[PDB]
Subunit: 297 residues, 3 copies
Amino acid sequence: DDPRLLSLFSAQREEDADIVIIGFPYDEGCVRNGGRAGAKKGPAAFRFFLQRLGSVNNLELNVDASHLKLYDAGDITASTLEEAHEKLESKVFTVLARGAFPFVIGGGNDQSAPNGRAMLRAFPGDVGVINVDSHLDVRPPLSDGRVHSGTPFRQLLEESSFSGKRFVEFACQGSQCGALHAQYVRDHQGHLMWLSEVRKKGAVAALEDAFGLTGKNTFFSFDVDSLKSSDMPGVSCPAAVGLSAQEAFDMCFLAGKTPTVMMMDMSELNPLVEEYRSPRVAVYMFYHFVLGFATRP
Amino acid sequence: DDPRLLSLFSAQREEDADIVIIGFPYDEGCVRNGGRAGAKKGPAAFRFFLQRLGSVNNLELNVDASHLKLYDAGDITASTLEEAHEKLESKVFTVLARGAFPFVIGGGNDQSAPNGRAMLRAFPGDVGVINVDSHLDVRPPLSDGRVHSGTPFRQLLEESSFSGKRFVEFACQGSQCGALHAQYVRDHQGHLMWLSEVRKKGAVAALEDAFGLTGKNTFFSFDVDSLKSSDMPGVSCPAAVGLSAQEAFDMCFLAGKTPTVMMMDMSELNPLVEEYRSPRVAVYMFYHFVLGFATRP
Amino acid sequence: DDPRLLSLFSAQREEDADIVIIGFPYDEGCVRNGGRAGAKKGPAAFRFFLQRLGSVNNLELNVDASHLKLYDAGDITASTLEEAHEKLESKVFTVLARGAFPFVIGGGNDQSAPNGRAMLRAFPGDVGVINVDSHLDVRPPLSDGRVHSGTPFRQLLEESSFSGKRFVEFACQGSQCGALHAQYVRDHQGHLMWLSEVRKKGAVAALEDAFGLTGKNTFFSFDVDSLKSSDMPGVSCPAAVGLSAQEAFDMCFLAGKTPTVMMMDMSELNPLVEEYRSPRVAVYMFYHFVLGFATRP
Ligand SMILES: [Mn+2]
Ligand SMILES: [Mn+2]
Ligand SMILES: [Mn+2]
Ligand SMILES: [Mn+2]
Ligand SMILES: [Mn+2]
Ligand SMILES: [Mn+2]
């Protein structure tokens, strides 16, 4: 007598679904970036609470998502991290190509590079990207060329088909972001929206501004370590300060109802660090996105 | 040289006390509702910090509670959950009957049904009830008729002597409350005060509004899982978002000084989930109620 | 490609440094005050993250601290707590005497007495002190005369060379502070700035007021249990309510740029209670002080 998210998984075939969930159970990217392992367990933890949470008809927000059809495409499987990237990008692109909405649960933030490449191919020369993250993630590769959880947006800014003017680093933190990396983003004409500015404007208002810059066909990329660890402790790099759970929910809801947002990912959920509260927040974030999506034209 | 709550337990006999604490060390109600066991340890954990916290003369709030007399009536003891309910209701009623204030520490939220029945009998046809809770708790019984932590306010709304117009669900959350259960409360003319509305108005202001609806002889029923788990992690169902510890304190203080509030309970404290920070919050909540009570005519 | 705090430890000799870190790895003071042991591990935990955190050039706040030179003078070593106090005071005074800035990481709050005595000797009859703390810490010694983490500011208020008019208890909490101890501070003409007043004014604004009272040569003494345990759980006495991590950062930044602040300590960090999130907050607090210091004339 209380239908929740699980009740929306009514599509017998993937192609019938409005939103397709794809899992990326890898954290080698995190370890390469010197982070704590654990994010490979994120998708499993997310699914666990995906089965339990989120009233489909939300009378507080006045949104009924009963009409949406969700499908779980399972995890990307590969013998190397780099092959996993290839298969993830390919999977995401196919979902985009038929006009469905792919949501990717990680796993390390390195997932965002393949995800971004899927976008750039689905909407040639017309893509926008926002990285919600306390960190810029424009670090160089490892000396042997290897990519990691800290390089995905350097990889995307280096794409010739992508305009940096439409890249926003959202809720980034000056205490954690280097002058060189700030310069790199800004020299690509990308935008830095510091945490303090987000809080001064209000999270939703600032995100609206961000969506104004990202424009059409926006990749909404959410590193959950942008949330204060008081709400979101289960990540490799716990934030002392950052977005609240409510700000996160409110932001995801906006993303959902914003017609230009064409895909979303969520990185850095680490059940080894904390396994109950954090995955629940991650699921509620997706839930708020689903509600917002329910309202879009 | 720093008298605290313990110093107020000066009443040699129960009948001399302004406020009587009653414990309900049961969590079978929680387990029946599919929750995590542990709340049966709540009263013991509460008592542990009851011995240590709360300056009797609070110079920040400018309230001296030195004149109040507290008494600990111990725990309700029974061989079944249902018998415990009977004995709890009977104990609470006797306390109400002689005009003392009963405070019941749980234990699962199922305690609120017997507590409510004590009220309805002490103030026939003139009772008000507010459920501070992220959940509505108007779930049906189990298929075999058994009651649980999720049914107490369905049980009270079904009471013929109780006017639903005077029932408030306070700080409830749309993400956790079903359309059917919202309908049930509203069809009984009960009121839904969503978390977002509480925060928009300010917690104390919204509670004043709530007390205006509940009217005379109000049962102030506080499920501590209405608090964000960042402050209150030690509950069966941890809230991602919700009331802050300060909002909770402020609310309890208001309850205390509000002459129409005739009893209080506090459910869902689960030391198995978290055993130090959460019981301390629970004690400070009671403490703030005691201070407010110290000021009432 | 991302210089952080560690990069500032470029001074080959202690005398070349603008800021000297001194460790006080003792918690016997805490245990005497009936607290939980663990703070003796604070300095080690602080150092661990001192090696990893804090962008030297902060583009969010627009402060480059690249020019500052830090030096780690190691820990004070003694066979008794009282001897450790003597050696700490002596070390701190020498640092003050040559016009450098000593920062002491504890360890129990008893460190603040020797620290205060160093100040009173470096700036005879011209010292100000602010104790950022949920507690007043003006408790009497033990019956055998022994000092503890709860007596340091009674010890300083009893100093004949120190004007109480220039003592501020900042963010103290009425629920934890006794009427007698409030009277003691106020009878010495000291000032009580309750948490509620700090939050009403805004933390930075209230601290500016406090610095106005403390005047010249101010000892900025920060007991990290003044922070809400949601952000700062790793202390002997976890606060249910209190300062946020951001308020703490903002306050430390102000302290840093305030020319009258001549030394700082930080007490009660307890890695045994919580070992990852809390030390990180402690380091970020120091970091924000360092930035502010970078801007001062
Ligand atoms: Mn990232
Ligand atoms: Mn990040
Ligand atoms: Mn409940
Ligand atoms: Mn509840
Ligand atoms: Mn202290
Ligand atoms: Mn303290």
